[PDB]
Amino acid sequence: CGKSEAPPPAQTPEVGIVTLEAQTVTLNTELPGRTNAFRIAEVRPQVNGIILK
Amino acid sequence: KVNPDGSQVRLKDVADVGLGGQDYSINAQFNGSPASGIAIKLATGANALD
C-alpha cells in the first residue's frame, strides 16, 4: 500500500574547492599612443631658384 | 571624445554608472522591514476565489 519513496538527503558532494593564499604581483597599465620617428628632417631650401635636377 | 594623438575621455570619470532604480517615487515597508509588492485589480466580470 505504498510506504516508500523517501527523498534522498543529498550532502551536495563533489564541490570544487580551491583555497587561496597571499601573493605579490606587479600591476600594469595599458595606454594608447602613437609611434614617432627618432630623427625626422624635412628638407627646406635655403636659396631661391628653379630645381634643375 | 578622442583626439588624434591618442588622448581620450570616456564616460567613466565625468559620470558614475550604476544599475539603480527607474523611479524612486514610491517604496514599501512590511512590519518595518523594507519590501516591495504588486497590488492586483481583478478583471471586470470574474470570480475571486478561483
Side-chain angles (χ1 to χ4, degrees):
Chain A
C1 274
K3 305 173 293 297
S4 295
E5 188 64 29
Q11 205 262 341
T12 311
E14 78 260 0
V15 56
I17 282 170
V18 161
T19 184
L20 57 100
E21 74 275 353
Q23 185 191 339
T24 179
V25 289
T26 171
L27 308 178
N28 291 260
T29 303
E30 288 277 345
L31 289 185
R34 291 286 202 170
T35 61
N36 270 339
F38 188 78
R39 273 188 199 96
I40 169 167
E42 44 97 24
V43 177
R44 286 168 67 193
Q46 276 158 313
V47 292
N48 320 323
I50 318 290
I51 300 177
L52 278 192
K53 188 63 69 67
Chain B
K1 78 187 178 182
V2 174
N3 287 158
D5 45 8
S7 160
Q8 53 183 27
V9 49
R10 296 168 153 179
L11 199 47
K12 187 159 55 193
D13 45 0
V14 75
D16 43 347
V17 165
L19 203 46
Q22 182 180 308
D23 192 343
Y24 298 92
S25 66
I26 56 180
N27 44 359
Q29 288 175 231
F30 179 82
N31 298 338
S33 173
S36 66
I38 176 167
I40 45 174
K41 305 174 169 292
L42 200 66
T44 319
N47 186 265
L49 280 85
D50 47 1

